[PDB]
Amino acid sequence: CAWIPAKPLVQGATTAQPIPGPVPVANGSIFQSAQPINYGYQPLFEDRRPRNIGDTLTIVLQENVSASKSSSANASRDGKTSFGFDTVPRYLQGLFGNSRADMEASGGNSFNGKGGANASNTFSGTLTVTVDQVLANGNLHVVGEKQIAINQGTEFIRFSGVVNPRTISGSNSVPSTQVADARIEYVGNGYINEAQNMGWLQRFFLNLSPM
Amino acid sequence: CAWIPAKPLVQGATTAQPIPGPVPVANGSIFQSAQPI
Amino acid sequence: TEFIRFSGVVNPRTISGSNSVPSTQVADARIEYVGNGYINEAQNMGWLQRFFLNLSPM
Amino acid sequence: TEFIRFSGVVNPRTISGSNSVPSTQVADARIEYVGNGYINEAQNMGWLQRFFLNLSPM
Amino acid sequence: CAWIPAKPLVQGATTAQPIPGPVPVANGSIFQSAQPI
Amino acid sequence: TEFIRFSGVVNPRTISGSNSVPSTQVADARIEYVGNGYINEAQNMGWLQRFFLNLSPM
Amino acid sequence: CAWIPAKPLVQGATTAQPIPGPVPVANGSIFQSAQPI
Amino acid sequence: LNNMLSQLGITVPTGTNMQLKNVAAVMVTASYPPFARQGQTIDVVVSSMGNAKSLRGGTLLMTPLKGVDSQVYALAQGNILVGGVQVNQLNGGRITNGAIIERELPTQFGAGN
Amino acid sequence: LNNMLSQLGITVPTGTNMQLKNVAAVMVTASYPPFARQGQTIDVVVSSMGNAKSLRGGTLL
Amino acid sequence: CTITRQAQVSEASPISGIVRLTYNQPLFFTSRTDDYVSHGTATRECQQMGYADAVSFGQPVGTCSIYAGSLCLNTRFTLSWQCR
Amino acid sequence: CTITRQAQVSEASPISGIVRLTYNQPLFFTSRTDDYVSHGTATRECQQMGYADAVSFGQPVGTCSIYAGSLCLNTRFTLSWQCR
Amino acid sequence: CTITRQAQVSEASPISGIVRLTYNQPLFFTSRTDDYVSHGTATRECQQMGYADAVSFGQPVGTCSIYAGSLCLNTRFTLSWQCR
Ligand SMILES: CCCCCCCCCCCCCCCC(=O)O[C@H](CCCCCCCCCCC)CC(=O)N[C@H]1[C@@H](OP(=O)(O)O)O[C@H](CO[C@@H]2O[C@H](CO)[C@@H](OP(=O)(O)O)[C@H](OC(=O)C[C@@H](CCCCCCCCCCC)OC(=O)CCCCCCCCCCCCC)[C@H]2NC(=O)C[C@@H](CCCCCCCCCCC)OC(=O)CCCCCCCCCCC)[C@@H](O)[C@@H]1OC(=O)C[C@H](O)CCCCCCCCCCC
Ligand SMILES: O=C(O)[C@H]1C[C@@H](O)[C@@H](O)[C@@H]([C@H](O)CO)O1
């Protein structure tokens, strides 16, 4: 039913009350600081690649794999021999007078075998991920997740991998093909996802039924 | 069935809380290192 | 789920430009592209058909 | 699974440019391209048909 | 059956943890060797 | 399996350029191109048909 | 049958482990020979 | 140049013009002296590689000098000096003390009789 | 030149212009003297191989 | 259920001085041998080679070694050490 | 199940001074002869040739030698030594 | 099964001073005569010719000599020596 209690994926308050801020200090200056947070050094001319645990990176999946395999074999043998007089000389009647030498035979053997296999997959999304840890060589372990609830179900797109902090180009974007340990999941929920499950009996027949 | 418990291939937390970093050293320099690795 | 796994030995001189090397230049090429789930199960012959294929005359 | 294996003796003077040599320039060329699984099994004659082919007259 | 245990042809771990490397020697040089092979 | 074997005597003056010599320039040319397996077996006459071919009148 | 044991025509190991080579001789030269054949 | 920029932290897109005329690819040659020490410096010779017209007032940037074993034995960086009808060679210059040694070759000196 | 660059650590794509005029392919000939020692040095003669106009102030590498 | 042991050695390459040990985990099982036996074995391997004083330097790596449909019957966990 | 021995010699090439020994492993079997007999045999081969003081210098290599459908009845493991 | 002997001579060419000996191996059989009789025969052939002090210099070569369908009834193994 649609009246069953449910928790939206975007939990918590959707509003933030702004803070008034700190009261000015009567130091004679109109300028007033705002409690600086981060004291870390930041380069000016570098490409702003992710560098720490909390840094975020953009991943363009653009995954495309296609593999094919084919094989065939054949073998055909055909033979057919004949011999007959239909008229035998008087002097040769002893050996071929009757159908004693009359011969006829045929034989065939044909075999044909074939085999094939294909496997293709594509992925054309964009997902922003967050650094999980910094490796010894500087490679970043990135993990990210995105949940979308269009209606009557939810989709989860999750990515994980190791990104070398040198393939990041320009606007903090790196193709998924450049990420090591690529783990990509695109799963769904709800009756829409349930309708794509085989069913217990059909699955059992598929895994056990002969032929 | 689709309700059987399952573990997504992307296991573990999908989030990392950023570290505040190291407190500045009062050496008179605005520049502050970040523990080179 | 689909698993694509690669293994081999690469000479550190055929790597061209953006850290890319064609698979044909990798020695000991081991390439696997396998699948799971009922989609993969549907591509299995089945025990009886496999037995007939391997044993049945002709 | 498909296995492609090569063996031979190569003169270290026919190697041209990018460490490539045509197979026709390799002495003792041993080339194998074999397969496994039911796909490969389906290309086997079968015991009875093979016996008939090797023994049956005509 | 597709549920029979099987070993993928690409056996072993598919990951390598990078080595931190050797600690620098306080010889006054920024350059540090890496154990030539 | 297919076996291609060659044997002969080559004069070390007809070798042109890239260590290549046409087979027509090789003395004692022995060339074999044989096969194995049921594919090769299917190209054998068969004992009875061979006997008839070699003995049967006409 | 396809399950009968068989020996591939390319017998033996398909891999060769590279040799580290000879340790350098402290003769003061960067160049080091490799045992000419 | 793109490799150096990427190492420094700038990743130029692969498809770009990059038509510059203030840089020249060069080969630097040095003479590793006997008993070379780690902190010592040596002179280097810089020679143009491509189609550069001249290297009058150029600067050599952190080139690793390697031996025949492919090992980095020195680091060279500095300013090129070139001569200012017998015209001087403007595609080849010398840097005095431009290279600092990094590795020391083991020697048998002092051993034996 | 491409082989040298690849050995040094730079891999130029196979399809490229590479139209340079500051280098020349040369053959170097030397006279190995009797009783030659490992550390000794000898004089060499460098001769142009292709279509180089001159080797006035060149460097043999 | 949550008991496993016997973490052994699997690789010792003098090139780069790398020692690799491996241990097994059943499907619904955990594994942590003693956190010290692996260090002892790595030190022994380093001493056998020209190096010594093995350092963990890394994190355990787990790759499935046995596949049964959409499951993982066994998992291999690797420990790496850099002899110094 | 996990017992094997008898690692023998298979190649001794003076060119490059390379000695190769081979041993066998059944399908569901392991193999490690003694870790020292191989070194002894390699040293003997080097002494027989003009070299001596064989060094392992490598890692075992395992290539299947017998094929039965989608299986590996026997596996050949090779040990290489560089005489010096 | 694993017993064979009687490695004989098959070629003695003074041009290049090459001596070739051959021995046979059944299908499921091995062969190693004595590792010394071949050297003795090669030395005898070299002495018969103008050379002497035969050296193995090579590795055994095995080429099938009898074919029965997809099998190898007999295998010929050759040993080469360079008289000096
Ligand atoms: C690789 C090469 C290796 C060498 C191979 C050697 C040869 C390999 C062997 C090849 C020859 C096959 C043998 C056949 C007979 C036999 O043994 O195997 C039979 C079973 C088959 C097995 C064969 C598998 C081989 C496996 C394959 C092996 C291949 C290698 C059993 C049997 O015996 N079955 C038998 C039985 O049946 P039943 O079961 O139901 O009861 O009885 C009935 C009734 O008997 C008849 O009754 C008639 C009246 O009614 C009566 O006439 P009438 O005048 O009286 O009226 C009549 O008398 C007569 O012919 C009267 C008279 C006729 C003279 C006319 C002139 C002809 C000259 C013709 C000249 C021939 C020219 C070559 O005779 C003869 O002188 C025959 C000539 C002898 C030539 C000698 C060669 C000199 C070299 C001359 C050399 C020339 C140089 C240029 C009665 N005939 C008989 O008895 C039968 C027999 C009597 C024997 C006594 C005579 C002296 C033999 C003396 C010695 C013979 C020894 C061999 O004669 C034959 O054929 C014998 C043929 C021999 C040829 C060999 C050549 C060697 C080359 C030498 C080469 C090295 C028969 O029908 C039936 O036999 C028949 O059907 C047969 C049919 O006819 C003929 C078909 C031939 C087609 C080719 C085969 C095609 C088959 C192919 C498929 C497999
Ligand atoms: O000469 C013989 O031996 C024959 C000639 C044919 O007639 C044959 O068929 C057989 C018959 O069976 C006798 O009844 O006799």
PDB file of N, CA and C in Angstrom, chain A residues 77-144:
ATOM      1  N   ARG A  77      32.954 -36.987 -45.927  1.00  0.00           N
ATOM      2  CA  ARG A  77      33.519 -38.036 -46.761  1.00  0.00           C
ATOM      3  C   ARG A  77      32.386 -38.734 -47.492  1.00  0.00           C
ATOM      4  N   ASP A  78      32.540 -38.899 -48.802  1.00  0.00           N
ATOM      5  CA  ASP A  78      31.537 -39.575 -49.612  1.00  0.00           C
ATOM      6  C   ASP A  78      32.231 -40.492 -50.604  1.00  0.00           C
ATOM      7  N   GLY A  79      31.759 -41.726 -50.689  1.00  0.00           N
ATOM      8  CA  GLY A  79      32.280 -42.670 -51.659  1.00  0.00           C
ATOM      9  C   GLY A  79      31.152 -43.518 -52.199  1.00  0.00           C
ATOM     10  N   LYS A  80      31.315 -43.961 -53.439  1.00  0.00           N
ATOM     11  CA  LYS A  80      30.265 -44.742 -54.084  1.00  0.00           C
ATOM     12  C   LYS A  80      30.844 -45.454 -55.294  1.00  0.00           C
ATOM     13  N   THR A  81      30.903 -46.780 -55.222  1.00  0.00           N
ATOM     14  CA  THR A  81      31.549 -47.607 -56.231  1.00  0.00           C
ATOM     15  C   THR A  81      30.535 -48.538 -56.878  1.00  0.00           C
ATOM     16  N   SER A  82      30.767 -48.854 -58.150  1.00  0.00           N
ATOM     17  CA  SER A  82      29.871 -49.713 -58.906  1.00  0.00           C
ATOM     18  C   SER A  82      30.672 -50.531 -59.908  1.00  0.00           C
ATOM     19  N   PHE A  83      30.111 -51.677 -60.289  1.00  0.00           N
ATOM     20  CA  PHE A  83      30.682 -52.532 -61.323  1.00  0.00           C
ATOM     21  C   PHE A  83      29.659 -53.563 -61.777  1.00  0.00           C
ATOM     22  N   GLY A  84      29.448 -53.673 -63.084  1.00  0.00           N
ATOM     23  CA  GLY A  84      28.490 -54.625 -63.610  1.00  0.00           C
ATOM     24  C   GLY A  84      28.700 -54.943 -65.076  1.00  0.00           C
ATOM     25  N   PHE A  85      28.494 -56.206 -65.453  1.00  0.00           N
ATOM     26  CA  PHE A  85      28.669 -56.611 -66.844  1.00  0.00           C
ATOM     27  C   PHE A  85      27.421 -56.330 -67.675  1.00  0.00           C
ATOM     28  N   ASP A  86      26.300 -56.953 -67.317  1.00  0.00           N
ATOM     29  CA  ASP A  86      25.082 -56.863 -68.115  1.00  0.00           C
ATOM     30  C   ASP A  86      25.218 -57.674 -69.399  1.00  0.00           C
ATOM     31  N   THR A  87      26.430 -58.144 -69.687  1.00  0.00           N
ATOM     32  CA  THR A  87      26.681 -59.059 -70.794  1.00  0.00           C
ATOM     33  C   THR A  87      28.043 -59.711 -70.596  1.00  0.00           C
ATOM     34  N   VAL A  88      28.077 -61.036 -70.507  1.00  0.00           N
ATOM     35  CA  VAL A  88      29.312 -61.745 -70.186  1.00  0.00           C
ATOM     36  C   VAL A  88      29.708 -62.633 -71.359  1.00  0.00           C
ATOM     37  N   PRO A  89      30.966 -62.604 -71.786  1.00  0.00           N
ATOM     38  CA  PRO A  89      31.398 -63.502 -72.858  1.00  0.00           C
ATOM     39  C   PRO A  89      31.306 -64.955 -72.424  1.00  0.00           C
ATOM     40  N   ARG A  90      31.116 -65.826 -73.416  1.00  0.00           N
ATOM     41  CA  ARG A  90      31.013 -67.253 -73.135  1.00  0.00           C
ATOM     42  C   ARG A  90      32.252 -67.758 -72.410  1.00  0.00           C
ATOM     43  N   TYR A  91      33.428 -67.269 -72.805  1.00  0.00           N
ATOM     44  CA  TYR A  91      34.672 -67.698 -72.183  1.00  0.00           C
ATOM     45  C   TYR A  91      34.873 -67.110 -70.792  1.00  0.00           C
ATOM     46  N   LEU A  92      34.199 -66.007 -70.469  1.00  0.00           N
ATOM     47  CA  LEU A  92      34.299 -65.389 -69.155  1.00  0.00           C
ATOM     48  C   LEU A  92      33.123 -65.720 -68.248  1.00  0.00           C
ATOM     49  N   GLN A  93      32.165 -66.522 -68.719  1.00  0.00           N
ATOM     50  CA  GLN A  93      31.006 -66.849 -67.893  1.00  0.00           C
ATOM     51  C   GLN A  93      31.407 -67.542 -66.597  1.00  0.00           C
ATOM     52  N   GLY A  94      32.570 -68.193 -66.575  1.00  0.00           N
ATOM     53  CA  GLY A  94      32.984 -68.892 -65.370  1.00  0.00           C
ATOM     54  C   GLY A  94      33.174 -67.965 -64.186  1.00  0.00           C
ATOM     55  N   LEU A  95      33.805 -66.813 -64.411  1.00  0.00           N
ATOM     56  CA  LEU A  95      34.100 -65.883 -63.330  1.00  0.00           C
ATOM     57  C   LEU A  95      33.001 -64.846 -63.128  1.00  0.00           C
ATOM     58  N   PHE A  96      32.467 -64.287 -64.214  1.00  0.00           N
ATOM     59  CA  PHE A  96      31.458 -63.238 -64.136  1.00  0.00           C
ATOM     60  C   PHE A  96      30.143 -63.648 -64.791  1.00  0.00           C
ATOM     61  N   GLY A  97      29.916 -64.950 -64.980  1.00  0.00           N
ATOM     62  CA  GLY A  97      28.711 -65.381 -65.671  1.00  0.00           C
ATOM     63  C   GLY A  97      27.446 -64.906 -64.985  1.00  0.00           C
ATOM     64  N   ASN A  98      27.374 -65.087 -63.672  1.00  0.00           N
ATOM     65  CA  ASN A  98      26.276 -64.562 -62.878  1.00  0.00           C
ATOM     66  C   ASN A  98      26.656 -63.176 -62.361  1.00  0.00           C
ATOM     67  N   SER A  99      25.909 -62.680 -61.381  1.00  0.00           N
ATOM     68  CA  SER A  99      26.234 -61.419 -60.730  1.00  0.00           C
ATOM     69  C   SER A  99      27.311 -61.578 -59.666  1.00  0.00           C
ATOM     70  N   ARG A 100      28.092 -62.660 -59.738  1.00  0.00           N
ATOM     71  CA  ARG A 100      29.110 -62.921 -58.727  1.00  0.00           C
ATOM     72  C   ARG A 100      30.043 -61.730 -58.552  1.00  0.00           C
ATOM     73  N   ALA A 101      30.449 -61.108 -59.655  1.00  0.00           N
ATOM     74  CA  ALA A 101      31.320 -59.943 -59.587  1.00  0.00           C
ATOM     75  C   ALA A 101      30.556 -58.628 -59.549  1.00  0.00           C
ATOM     76  N   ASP A 102      29.264 -58.641 -59.867  1.00  0.00           N
ATOM     77  CA  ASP A 102      28.469 -57.422 -59.833  1.00  0.00           C
ATOM     78  C   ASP A 102      28.503 -56.812 -58.441  1.00  0.00           C
ATOM     79  N   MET A 103      28.953 -55.563 -58.362  1.00  0.00           N
ATOM     80  CA  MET A 103      29.175 -54.895 -57.091  1.00  0.00           C
ATOM     81  C   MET A 103      28.572 -53.499 -57.120  1.00  0.00           C
ATOM     82  N   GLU A 104      28.094 -53.062 -55.960  1.00  0.00           N
ATOM     83  CA  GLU A 104      27.542 -51.723 -55.801  1.00  0.00           C
ATOM     84  C   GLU A 104      27.595 -51.368 -54.325  1.00  0.00           C
ATOM     85  N   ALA A 105      28.129 -50.191 -54.012  1.00  0.00           N
ATOM     86  CA  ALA A 105      28.269 -49.795 -52.618  1.00  0.00           C
ATOM     87  C   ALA A 105      28.310 -48.279 -52.530  1.00  0.00           C
ATOM     88  N   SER A 106      27.806 -47.747 -51.419  1.00  0.00           N
ATOM     89  CA  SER A 106      27.835 -46.318 -51.154  1.00  0.00           C
ATOM     90  C   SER A 106      28.091 -46.092 -49.673  1.00  0.00           C
ATOM     91  N   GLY A 107      28.712 -44.959 -49.363  1.00  0.00           N
ATOM     92  CA  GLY A 107      29.016 -44.603 -47.993  1.00  0.00           C
ATOM     93  C   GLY A 107      29.190 -43.110 -47.807  1.00  0.00           C
ATOM     94  N   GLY A 108      28.718 -42.600 -46.681  1.00  0.00           N
ATOM     95  CA  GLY A 108      28.813 -41.179 -46.396  1.00  0.00           C
ATOM     96  C   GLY A 108      29.050 -40.942 -44.924  1.00  0.00           C
ATOM     97  N   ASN A 109      29.711 -39.829 -44.623  1.00  0.00           N
ATOM     98  CA  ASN A 109      30.008 -39.453 -43.245  1.00  0.00           C
ATOM     99  C   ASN A 109      30.179 -37.942 -43.209  1.00  0.00           C
ATOM    100  N   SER A 110      29.200 -37.237 -42.648  1.00  0.00           N
ATOM    101  CA  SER A 110      29.217 -35.784 -42.589  1.00  0.00           C
ATOM    102  C   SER A 110      29.124 -35.333 -41.140  1.00  0.00           C
ATOM    103  N   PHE A 111      29.993 -34.403 -40.757  1.00  0.00           N
ATOM    104  CA  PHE A 111      30.012 -33.856 -39.409  1.00  0.00           C
ATOM    105  C   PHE A 111      30.195 -32.350 -39.488  1.00  0.00           C
ATOM    106  N   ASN A 112      29.436 -31.619 -38.673  1.00  0.00           N
ATOM    107  CA  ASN A 112      29.517 -30.165 -38.613  1.00  0.00           C
ATOM    108  C   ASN A 112      29.327 -29.726 -37.171  1.00  0.00           C
ATOM    109  N   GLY A 113      30.310 -29.021 -36.632  1.00  0.00           N
ATOM    110  CA  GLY A 113      30.233 -28.483 -35.283  1.00  0.00           C
ATOM    111  C   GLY A 113      30.477 -26.987 -35.294  1.00  0.00           C
ATOM    112  N   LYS A 114      29.776 -26.275 -34.416  1.00  0.00           N
ATOM    113  CA  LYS A 114      29.875 -24.827 -34.335  1.00  0.00           C
ATOM    114  C   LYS A 114      29.869 -24.402 -32.875  1.00  0.00           C
ATOM    115  N   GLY A 115      30.387 -23.205 -32.628  1.00  0.00           N
ATOM    116  CA  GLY A 115      30.368 -22.643 -31.292  1.00  0.00           C
ATOM    117  C   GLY A 115      30.620 -21.157 -31.343  1.00  0.00           C
ATOM    118  N   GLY A 116      30.053 -20.443 -30.376  1.00  0.00           N
ATOM    119  CA  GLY A 116      30.201 -19.001 -30.337  1.00  0.00           C
ATOM    120  C   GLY A 116      29.886 -18.463 -28.962  1.00  0.00           C
ATOM    121  N   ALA A 117      30.250 -17.200 -28.766  1.00  0.00           N
ATOM    122  CA  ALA A 117      30.045 -16.535 -27.488  1.00  0.00           C
ATOM    123  C   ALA A 117      30.264 -15.043 -27.667  1.00  0.00           C
ATOM    124  N   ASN A 118      29.477 -14.245 -26.951  1.00  0.00           N
ATOM    125  CA  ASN A 118      29.590 -12.796 -26.985  1.00  0.00           C
ATOM    126  C   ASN A 118      29.371 -12.238 -25.589  1.00  0.00           C
ATOM    127  N   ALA A 119      29.955 -11.069 -25.336  1.00  0.00           N
ATOM    128  CA  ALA A 119      29.767 -10.397 -24.053  1.00  0.00           C
ATOM    129  C   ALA A 119      30.093  -8.926 -24.228  1.00  0.00           C
ATOM    130  N   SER A 120      29.099  -8.062 -24.041  1.00  0.00           N
ATOM    131  CA  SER A 120      29.297  -6.628 -24.183  1.00  0.00           C
ATOM    132  C   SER A 120      28.631  -5.906 -23.024  1.00  0.00           C
ATOM    133  N   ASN A 121      29.176  -4.741 -22.688  1.00  0.00           N
ATOM    134  CA  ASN A 121      28.609  -3.903 -21.643  1.00  0.00           C
ATOM    135  C   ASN A 121      28.998  -2.455 -21.898  1.00  0.00           C
ATOM    136  N   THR A 122      28.108  -1.547 -21.501  1.00  0.00           N
ATOM    137  CA  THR A 122      28.312  -0.119 -21.681  1.00  0.00           C
ATOM    138  C   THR A 122      27.817   0.627 -20.451  1.00  0.00           C
ATOM    139  N   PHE A 123      28.405   1.797 -20.220  1.00  0.00           N
ATOM    140  CA  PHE A 123      28.070   2.643 -19.082  1.00  0.00           C
ATOM    141  C   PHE A 123      28.405   4.078 -19.453  1.00  0.00           C
ATOM    142  N   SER A 124      27.429   4.976 -19.335  1.00  0.00           N
ATOM    143  CA  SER A 124      27.549   6.339 -19.848  1.00  0.00           C
ATOM    144  C   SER A 124      27.074   7.358 -18.819  1.00  0.00           C
ATOM    145  N   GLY A 125      27.556   7.242 -17.583  1.00  0.00           N
ATOM    146  CA  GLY A 125      27.167   8.135 -16.516  1.00  0.00           C
ATOM    147  C   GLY A 125      28.310   9.002 -16.014  1.00  0.00           C
ATOM    148  N   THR A 126      27.956   9.902 -15.099  1.00  0.00           N
ATOM    149  CA  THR A 126      28.918  10.754 -14.413  1.00  0.00           C
ATOM    150  C   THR A 126      28.582  10.766 -12.930  1.00  0.00           C
ATOM    151  N   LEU A 127      29.574  10.470 -12.094  1.00  0.00           N
ATOM    152  CA  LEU A 127      29.370  10.378 -10.655  1.00  0.00           C
ATOM    153  C   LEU A 127      30.518  11.058  -9.930  1.00  0.00           C
ATOM    154  N   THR A 128      30.190  11.906  -8.959  1.00  0.00           N
ATOM    155  CA  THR A 128      31.197  12.561  -8.136  1.00  0.00           C
ATOM    156  C   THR A 128      31.499  11.696  -6.920  1.00  0.00           C
ATOM    157  N   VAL A 129      32.777  11.383  -6.722  1.00  0.00           N
ATOM    158  CA  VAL A 129      33.212  10.494  -5.656  1.00  0.00           C
ATOM    159  C   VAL A 129      34.069  11.282  -4.671  1.00  0.00           C
ATOM    160  N   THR A 130      34.337  10.660  -3.527  1.00  0.00           N
ATOM    161  CA  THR A 130      35.138  11.255  -2.469  1.00  0.00           C
ATOM    162  C   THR A 130      36.339  10.368  -2.179  1.00  0.00           C
ATOM    163  N   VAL A 131      37.468  10.998  -1.849  1.00  0.00           N
ATOM    164  CA  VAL A 131      38.669  10.241  -1.529  1.00  0.00           C
ATOM    165  C   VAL A 131      38.458   9.466  -0.237  1.00  0.00           C
ATOM    166  N   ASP A 132      38.891   8.208  -0.232  1.00  0.00           N
ATOM    167  CA  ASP A 132      38.814   7.367   0.956  1.00  0.00           C
ATOM    168  C   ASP A 132      40.111   7.353   1.750  1.00  0.00           C
ATOM    169  N   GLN A 133      41.252   7.321   1.067  1.00  0.00           N
ATOM    170  CA  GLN A 133      42.549   7.359   1.725  1.00  0.00           C
ATOM    171  C   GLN A 133      43.611   7.649   0.678  1.00  0.00           C
ATOM    172  N   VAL A 134      44.779   8.068   1.152  1.00  0.00           N
ATOM    173  CA  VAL A 134      45.918   8.376   0.295  1.00  0.00           C
ATOM    174  C   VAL A 134      46.932   7.253   0.448  1.00  0.00           C
ATOM    175  N   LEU A 135      47.309   6.644  -0.671  1.00  0.00           N
ATOM    176  CA  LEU A 135      48.249   5.536  -0.651  1.00  0.00           C
ATOM    177  C   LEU A 135      49.684   6.050  -0.544  1.00  0.00           C
ATOM    178  N   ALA A 136      50.615   5.108  -0.377  1.00  0.00           N
ATOM    179  CA  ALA A 136      52.014   5.477  -0.187  1.00  0.00           C
ATOM    180  C   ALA A 136      52.569   6.204  -1.405  1.00  0.00           C
ATOM    181  N   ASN A 137      52.189   5.769  -2.605  1.00  0.00           N
ATOM    182  CA  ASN A 137      52.695   6.370  -3.832  1.00  0.00           C
ATOM    183  C   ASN A 137      51.937   7.625  -4.237  1.00  0.00           C
ATOM    184  N   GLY A 138      50.932   8.036  -3.467  1.00  0.00           N
ATOM    185  CA  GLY A 138      50.131   9.195  -3.791  1.00  0.00           C
ATOM    186  C   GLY A 138      48.810   8.886  -4.459  1.00  0.00           C
ATOM    187  N   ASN A 139      48.583   7.638  -4.859  1.00  0.00           N
ATOM    188  CA  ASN A 139      47.305   7.267  -5.447  1.00  0.00           C
ATOM    189  C   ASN A 139      46.184   7.447  -4.430  1.00  0.00           C
ATOM    190  N   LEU A 140      45.019   7.850  -4.925  1.00  0.00           N
ATOM    191  CA  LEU A 140      43.860   8.125  -4.088  1.00  0.00           C
ATOM    192  C   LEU A 140      42.838   7.010  -4.246  1.00  0.00           C
ATOM    193  N   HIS A 141      42.360   6.486  -3.121  1.00  0.00           N
ATOM    194  CA  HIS A 141      41.265   5.525  -3.117  1.00  0.00           C
ATOM    195  C   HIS A 141      39.957   6.303  -3.037  1.00  0.00           C
ATOM    196  N   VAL A 142      39.170   6.246  -4.107  1.00  0.00           N
ATOM    197  CA  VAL A 142      37.953   7.036  -4.244  1.00  0.00           C
ATOM    198  C   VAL A 142      36.754   6.109  -4.119  1.00  0.00           C
ATOM    199  N   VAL A 143      35.779   6.526  -3.317  1.00  0.00           N
ATOM    200  CA  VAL A 143      34.507   5.832  -3.165  1.00  0.00           C
ATOM    201  C   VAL A 143      33.396   6.868  -3.221  1.00  0.00           C
ATOM    202  N   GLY A 144      32.342   6.569  -3.972  1.00  0.00           N
ATOM    203  CA  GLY A 144      31.228   7.487  -4.103  1.00  0.00           C
ATOM    204  C   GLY A 144      29.930   6.739  -4.305  1.00  0.00           C
TER     205      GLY A 144
END
